[PDB]
Amino acid sequence: QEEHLKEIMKHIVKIEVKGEEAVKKEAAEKLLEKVPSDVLEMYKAIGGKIYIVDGDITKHISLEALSEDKKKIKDIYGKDALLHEHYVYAKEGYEPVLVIQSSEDYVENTEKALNVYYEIGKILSRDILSKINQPYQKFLDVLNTIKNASDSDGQDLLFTNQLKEHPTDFSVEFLEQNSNEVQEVFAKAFAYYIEPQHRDVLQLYAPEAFNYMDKFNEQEINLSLEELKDQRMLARYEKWEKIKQHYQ
Amino acid sequence: FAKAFAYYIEPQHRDVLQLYAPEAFNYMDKFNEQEINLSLEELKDQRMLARYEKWEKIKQHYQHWSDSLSEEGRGLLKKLQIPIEPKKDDIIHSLSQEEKELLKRIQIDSSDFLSTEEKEFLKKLQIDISEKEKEFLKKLKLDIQPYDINQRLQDTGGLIDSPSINLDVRKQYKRDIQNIDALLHQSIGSTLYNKIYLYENMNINNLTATLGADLVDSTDNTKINRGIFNEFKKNFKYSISSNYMIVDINERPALDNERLKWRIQLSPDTRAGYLENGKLILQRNIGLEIKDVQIIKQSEKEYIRIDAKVVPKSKIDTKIQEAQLNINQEWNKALGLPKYTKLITFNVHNRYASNIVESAYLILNEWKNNIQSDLIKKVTNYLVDGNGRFVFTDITLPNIAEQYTHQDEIYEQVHSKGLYVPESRSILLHGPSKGVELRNDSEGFIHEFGHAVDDYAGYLLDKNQSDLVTNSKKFIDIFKEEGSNLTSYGRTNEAEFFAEAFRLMHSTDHAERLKVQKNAPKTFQFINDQIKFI
Amino acid sequence: PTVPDRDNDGIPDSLEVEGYTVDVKNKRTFLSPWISNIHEKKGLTKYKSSPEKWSTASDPYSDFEKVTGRIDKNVSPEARHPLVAAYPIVHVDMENIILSKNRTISKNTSTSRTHTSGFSNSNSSTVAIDHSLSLAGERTWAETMGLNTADTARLNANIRYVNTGTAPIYNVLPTTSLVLGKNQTLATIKAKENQLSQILAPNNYYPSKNLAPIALNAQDDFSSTPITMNYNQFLELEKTKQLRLDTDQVYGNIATYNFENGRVRVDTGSNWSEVLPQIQETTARIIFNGKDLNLVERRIAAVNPSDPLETTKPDMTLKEALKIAFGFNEPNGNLQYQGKDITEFDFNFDQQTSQNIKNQLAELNATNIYTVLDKIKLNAKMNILIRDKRFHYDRNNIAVGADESVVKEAHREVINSSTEGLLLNIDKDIRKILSGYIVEIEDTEGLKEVINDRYDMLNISSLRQDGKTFIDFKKYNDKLPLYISNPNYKVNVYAVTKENTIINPSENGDTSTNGIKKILIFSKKGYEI
Amino acid sequence: PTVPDRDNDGIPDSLEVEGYTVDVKNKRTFLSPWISNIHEKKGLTKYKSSPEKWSTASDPYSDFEKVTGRIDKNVSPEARHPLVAAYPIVHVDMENIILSKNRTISKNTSTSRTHTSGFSNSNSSTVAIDHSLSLAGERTWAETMGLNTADTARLNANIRYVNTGTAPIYNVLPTTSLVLGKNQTLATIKAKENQLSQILAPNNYYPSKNLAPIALNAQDDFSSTPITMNYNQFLELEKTKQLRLDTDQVYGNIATYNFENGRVRVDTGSNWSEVLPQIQETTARIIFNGKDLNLVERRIAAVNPSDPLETTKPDMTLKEALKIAFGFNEPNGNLQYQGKDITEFDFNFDQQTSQNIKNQLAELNATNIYTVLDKIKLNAKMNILIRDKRFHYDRNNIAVGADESVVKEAHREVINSSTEGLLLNIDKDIRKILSGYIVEIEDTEGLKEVINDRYDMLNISSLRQDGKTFIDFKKYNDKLPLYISNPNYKVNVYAVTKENTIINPSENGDTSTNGIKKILIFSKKGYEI
Incomplete structure (x- = not known):
């Protein structure tokens, strides 16, 4: 009986008050920590850097003057959301920039953390590796193993509607003509792998996809930085x- | 003293002491377990x-x-x-050309760059024996040390x-x-x-x-x-x-x-x-x-x-980098800069280190609260647009890194309380020295800040041309009339004058602000007109 | 860090002494040290407590559980605050009786929980039997019931239990003895065994208003007429119409909160009959009749100078006590309870407490307590009684009357008037001190004809289902409408408050309302109807 | 690191032997070694105790628990000190009886807790029934109740229990036997079962003054008339009009404090009948009648030379004992109890104790104990009796009389005098040793006419609600005002003390106040009246 009080007691009794705005700074910094550092060095090396705004992301100097038309965004689940309400946007251009809206609830909940990691994966696949065309046959080979497999809902988890209608196996030509769809599938996988609570779900429904990403984050990311530097x-x-x- | 001493040594009473005389306990706590051995040697040291x-x-x-x-x-x-004194006979035998006669009849006591002891060295040479002669004097200084x-x-x-x-x-x-x-x-x-x-x-x-x-x-x-x-x-x-x-x-x-x-x-x-x-x-x-x-x-x-x-020095060195990260991360959010910028990097290697680092947390606080917010952001944006970083040091300015490289002349060396390098867009603050004029350290910063801000204002007018706000005929003349209505240091030239005027117009003592208003009315509306560009 | 916590009550030491508060963060609840500027706008209450008491109030729920909500969800809201003792207060309410001889006089009764003066910690109530004549021909009870000098009457009543405290009782239900007069104990109602398996949450009845009330007489074979009563007793009853119901404090076990699974289980070791003594010797007692003229009792934890451990409790000032115990607030910084300023109430103190407060008033050099309210320290064992200043009260602190001026003012809103009666809308509280109305007719030349001219014929005022009072003339008339000998004749109506009522015929059995002090309540001419 | 605590009672050794005190720092309580200068200004008591006793007093509360306040909040204040045993002391008080034959003598009674002499540890009380005639015509009880040689009377009394000790009893209630004469046991009062669920805190009644007292006869079917009583017995009662109530020490369980959560639960393992023997064999007993002339008994822990473990207790000198057990203090360094100097009291000792103190008085070369008071050592088992020196006492150490001279000063303040009576203001203690007053009228030439000239017609002195005694002449007069045959005739009023009263008609059945020892109490002429 005396044992249980402690655990509940520690979780509830915050000894000191961090402050009104410190908590905000501490939350964002903890989030970005979980992503392997080597990814951040590749981002800085290719130029622009992430700056955390505090107010309505819809109105910022860097983003107000560009891409007004693209007000329609799709979350990880595919449902459409207006940009003003949404809490994180990114833009691909001459100055690659990624902006995240500060909040105090990134450690406690997860649905918000998932979108940030999701955006890091999209920048990585479309803006970083694309300079070297790194997604290729190995990624395509795992990809092909998912489409043809016994009632594997894995497809439903990573493929959009456009993919579910290609009758035959994937071809090296298709990736070249269409490269936004494939890059998206990479991004989702990247996101699910980083977030601890979702890690189990990924490995459970797409074993090979999990295996690919496990060896990738383990010892195949230092190779990404060195080869990028070689240009x-x-x-x-x-x-x-x-x-x-x-x-x- | 004895009473307090007694209560602390007796185990059972120590707690009583701590409850009713907290401060007394603290003093005695540190006293009896590190300082007492330090005390013993000095008695024997007699x-x-x-x-x-x-x-x-x-x-x-x-x-x-x-x-x-x-x-x-x-x-x-x-x-x-033993300090080694330079021998005159060696330097004289090392020149041998036309410069010495030219040097012979020069108004020696009119160079601010020279110091008292160096004037005396020159006066000893002079007994033996606004133009182009003060540049030749700059070279000689690098040889008489x-x-x-x-x-x-x-x-x-x-x-x-x-x-x-x-x-x-x-x-x-x-x-x-x-x-x-x-x-x-x-x-x-x-x-x-x-x-x-x-x-x-x-x-x-x-x-x-x-x-x-x-x-x-x-x-x-x-x-x-x-x-x-x-x-x-x-x-x-x-x-x-x-x-x-x-x-x-x-x-x-x-x-x-x-x-x-x-x-x-x-x-x-x-x-x-x-x-x-x-x-x-x-x-x-x-x-x-x-x-x-x-x-x-x-x-x-x-x-x-x-x-x-x-x-081990490395153990202290670790403190400096961790201090570097705390200050740069804090100001990027307050300013709006990218998360990973190396802006306030400071390298210090001297005896008064710890005060320099902490004094950063004070110069900037006074710097922001005293200047119009939009000016800082706009100018900081300009600074990041290049590779410039703020640099706080405790070594003489000519030795940091950036200054020597870009000037390129050996004789182009300059050391003083502050310095601004347009080519590198960096602000340098040497803590250890004392401004022969400035009252505190904050003012030293604002003066250097003035030189930097002036460069961007000139940059916005035309992108291709690199120039300052001065050299435009609508300001050179203005310096000829009111230029001598303030401190004698600003009378030196246009560049220092703008910087000199800038701190005073933004001083924390409103009286100073009033003074510049009633002594140089024209400049006061002019300055408000360049800063408008935002 | 090993944050220190001697009392072993979850909250660390420093937090309890200085002030803390629990606040729900989106879906997770965490405990925080009180920050003056960021918590006040959110309407959060500043808690304080004792760093050396597992339960500052001393009742069975720890400091941590009360404010966090891990507690029997039945404990009344006002008792969630760490400085308000949560305990049960059970008294008995008797609705109606019937009498006969071992032709049954069945009258409805009204009961109020009582408190009298040197007042002690024991609950008692007091029933009053209606005296009005339900039957016209039933003059003199002595004859309506064939009672002879050598007879005995049988008593059969219906009762319900009322919990006006702040915590639930669970298994047992208390024994309580009925007594007539000063010391004549007629009967003790047995403690039925293993039958009160239900719960009495505060402000609830057992059995509920939807079920038959527990019959007092067993109706079984336990005793043929348990309530025997010789003749002489019946006489006192005829003169007084009063009975007392004394009840003891033997409640059941206590419901505790289990951390392992969040189950609330009734522990058979801990029993309220062991805790109440602790509470009653370490708290200040405040009695208030503000809400609906009923006696509400609350206990606040106050310091006791003589006892080391007891100086640990946070100092409690009177003003704050009223604020957290009953609901007083400060719209404009003036203490008030739903409009009524604190100044419309009396403060009465027991001789000890009176003396103690006289001291407190001396070191501050003040004479009107209503001002220095926020500077009065409460110590343990003081007893304070706050009663409405406008109503008259009897010896047992029951509302019994009022000043005539209040009575008239309560009637200045005549919603309707006709020859069949009045339909008023009066403030629900006043109609608990009015026994009835005298109707009379006045000749244009000053004569006076009283319609219901009998002492026991006053209950003529019913209440409609929409809260509109309706006076019926045909009730104690001859089932005929109201006649008027002159459209210019004024109709005067007087009201008689309980205190000013007669309960038995006089010496020579006078039934007229002559020697009764009557207050005029209405007077409209015959044509103004 | 050791900070040794062999007795395992929280307080370390050195603290217990030398002196300690607990003092509250803003909200946290800690134990500290006695500092002479910082604690004296704070009004703190210097405690001492035994480093080898979990409870120096030997009662069930630890040395640490008592002084810290973690304890059943009912233990009386003066017993919080570690050297005063806390235990219950229950005796029975009988309020009134009634008599009849198997014309009902219903009389009110007054009881006082008694103690007689080699006096032993067993509780007893003594009732004395009032002899005054409530009814004029009720001369001779034998006839007001039809008692015949072959009849039997029934006794029906009311009793309440009084706890004059220092600790509460919980479950049980003591068995107690009624006895008339020396050894004629009339009845043993049953130990009611599972009925004393309430609490007897010190100085309280059960049931409280606000409830009916427990009827002695069951009124149920247990025995039709348990208290039968033969004729000869009734005669014995008539000559002595006194009974005795012997009670044993079978109390209930003990209430203990639980450190983990501060709950006080009645543990069924520890029982007072195992503790009392320890207390009674290791403490010195002090009996005092100072407060209100009632025997208050306290026990102080003293050393017993013969026993190793016992030499550990702090030496206790008599002077401190009075200070900590009863309230004696030192305004000017002279021991006194609320003004009355210590010299106005007698010291009586049991024969054992007497011898011991005579020795102690010899090695100091003193004759008056009142001087060397602070130099008298207490050993275990002395019994000391301190009674007010001014009053006369009987065999049962009850206050019974006084020197006439003292009696007079108590009346020298005539607040008012008229022909209808006196409303005096006497010191509350004297009017409990005066049985009544003799009123007489004096002719201008020295004659003497005594109004209430009957032994059983003395009760003429009542007490008003403001504590002013009022003497009514019309009571045993002819309901007529007071007549004076001459405005020069002196009016004398006399008082009769208990010891000098008659309780039955004399040898030749004399009813005159002749052979009654009478004290002059008042003498004003007609003009003054």
């Missing part, structure tokens, strides 16, 4: 500096 | 016999090292102890490759220090002795000339003003020594200008050298954490007692 002349030149200096 | 015994017990340990000393080692050490190894080390912070002096001199300096670095091969570590304390007398003006001007009671120099003291102790928590410490062995009476009495503990791993003249040379790049700051009384005169413990 920058200065990266090659700094590399020359270090190698020549030591053994000289 | 008996000459004990001091002699301590000095002798130290000799034998260093006997082998001393007996193996070569001539080159001793000769090098001799130079470090005394050969002082120890002086070079703090100005450069240990970065010996600094291209701030002539290459030959640079080669000369690097060789002597590296040779000295090899000399200090013996560690203090032994089984023969435990905690050893050594002392060093230091002048307060070397750490902060701003506090040093009012540290001593205006009327009686034997008392210290409590009000200024409280500020000084506030954030003095750790320090790092990059140069060669010259320490004593037994406490001796100090000279007039030395009001700090350091008590330094060593670690068995610290590498060090023994000197026959009762002094010790510690290795460079040592880190020290300050445990306490207090006022003590000695021989009817007041002093500041400062203790310290040697620790």
